[PDB]
Paper text:
Value of the data• The Pleckstrin homology domains have long been associated with their binding to phospholipids. Direct interactions between PH domains and other proteins have been reported, however, structural insight into such interactions has been scarce. Although all PH domains from [name]-[name] bind activated [name], the binding affinities vary greatly, ranging from an IC50 of 3 μM for PRG-PH, to over 150 μM for p115-PH. The overall structures of the two PH·[name] complexes reported here are very similar; residues from the PH domains that interact with activated [name] are well conserved among all [name]-[name].
The structure of [name]·GTPγS bound to the PH domain of [name]-[name] was determined at a resolution of 2.0 Å by molecular replacement using separate search models for a modified PRG-PH domain and [name]. There are two complexes in the asymmetric unit. The final atomic model comprises residues 2195–2304 and 2307–2333 of the [name]-PH domain, and residues 3–181 of [name] bound to GTPγS and Mg2+. The electron density is well defined for GTPγS and Mg2+ in the guanine nucleotide binding pocket of [name]. Here again, the switch I and switch II regions of [name] interacts directly with the β5, β6 and β7-strands of the PH domain from [name]. The structure of the PH domain from [name] shares a similar fold to other PH domains in the [name] RhoGEF family. The two complexes in the asymmetric unit are held together by an interface formed between the α3 and α4 helices of [name], and the β-hairpin module near the N-terminal helix of [name]-PH that lies outside of the canonical core of the PH domain, and buries a surface area of about 330 A2. There is however no evidence that the complex of [name]-PH and [name] forms a dimer based on size-exclusion chromatography. [name]-PH on the other hand, shows stronger binding towards [name]·GTPγS, with an IC50 value of about 20 μM. A closer examination of the two structures reveals that the interface between p114-PH and activated [name] buries less surface area (approximately 500 A2) than that between [name]-PH and [name] (about 570 A2).
Residue numbers in the entry:
A (entry chain F): 3 to 181
B (entry chain B): 2195 to 2304, 2307 to 2335
The structure:
Amino acid sequence: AIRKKLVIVGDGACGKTCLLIVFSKDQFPEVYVPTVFENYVADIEVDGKQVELALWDTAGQEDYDRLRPLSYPDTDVILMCFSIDSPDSLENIPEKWTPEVKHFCPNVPIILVGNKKDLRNDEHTRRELAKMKQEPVKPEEGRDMANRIGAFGYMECSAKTKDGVREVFEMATRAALQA
Amino acid sequence: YEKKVRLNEIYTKTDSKSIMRMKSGQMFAKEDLKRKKLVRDGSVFLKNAAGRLKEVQAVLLTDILVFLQEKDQKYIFASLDQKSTVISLKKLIVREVAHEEKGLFLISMGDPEMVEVHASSKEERNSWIQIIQDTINHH
Ligand SMILES: Nc1nc2c(ncn2[C@@H]2O[C@H](COP(=O)(O)OP(=O)(O)OP(O)(O)=S)[C@@H](O)[C@H]2O)c(=O)[nH]1
Ligand SMILES: [Mg+2]
C-alpha cells in the first residue's frame, strides 16, 4: 500500500530480467530476450511495512543508452548488477553504470548486486574462465566495489536457484523506504 | 463508428492556430489533420512529470497518435511538460504500466520520450494498447 519505484541496471546478459521475474513471478524465464524496456510489479512485506514495488527493467546493451534515462525519474532505489561469472561486468560498474546513475540519479540509494552466484563454484564455468586467465568474482571484490561506489548495501544472488533473491529485494525495499 | 465523419468533426473543432512540434523536428498543425485517416478516438488522461493527470482526447490516426485538450469549445494540441503530444507510430513501442492496470506507456524511439496514459478502466487500457499496437504493425 506504500508505493516505491525500483530500477535495475547493468551489463547486457548479467541477469537483470531473470532477477525481476524470479522475484515477482517466482518463475525463471526460460527464453532470453534482450530488454529494450519493460516494467513489472510485486508486493513485499518488510519490517511490518507493506510495499508495492514497481520494477523498471532496462536495456544492458549500449545501443539503448539513449533510452535508459527515461526510466530514472522518481526512482527510490537502484539495483546495479554484475554477473559473478564475468569479472568484466564488475569492472563496468565504476566505468559505466555508476557514472550514468550518478548523472541522472545522484542521491538515490544503490544496492550493488552480483548475479549468477550459482556459477561461482561451477566447474565448467571456472574451466572456461581459466582459459582466459580469469576467475569468478569473489565476494570480497564485490564488497570492495560497493564501498568504492558508495552503495547502500551489497548482495549476491542466483535467480536460477533462488538463493538470495528475497534478501536482495528486502534490502532494496529498506533502501527505498529511506530518506 | 463512422471514422471519416468523426475525423471531419475533430478537424473542424480544433483551433487553427494550435500547433505541436514532433520529436523529429516536424511541426504539426491543424491543417495537417485534413487528409489523415482515423482509427479510433476517445477520452484518456496524460500523467504529468509532477505525477498529476490531465484529461485529453486521444486521436489515433493510421500514421500518428494525437492528444488534444478541449479549450473554450475548441480542440488544441495537449501540452505535457515539453513532451511532444503528436507522436509518430514509426519506432513507437507500447507497454502496460504494471503497477497501474489503468495505465499504458508510449515510448517514442527516435532523443526518445515516454508518455504515460491512463484509460478509465483496465478493459479500456487493454483495448487501447491493442489498437495502438495493431496500427503500429499495419494490421
Ligand atoms: N546460471 C545462471 N544463469 C542465469 C541466471 N540469471 C540469468 N541467467 C541467464 O543469463 C542470460 C541473460 O539473462 P537476463 O536476465 O535475460 O539478462 P539481462 O541482464 O536482463 O540482459 P539484457 O536484457 O540487458 S541484454 C539468460 O541465458 C539467462 O537464463 C542465474 O542466476 N544463473
Ligand atoms: Mg533483460
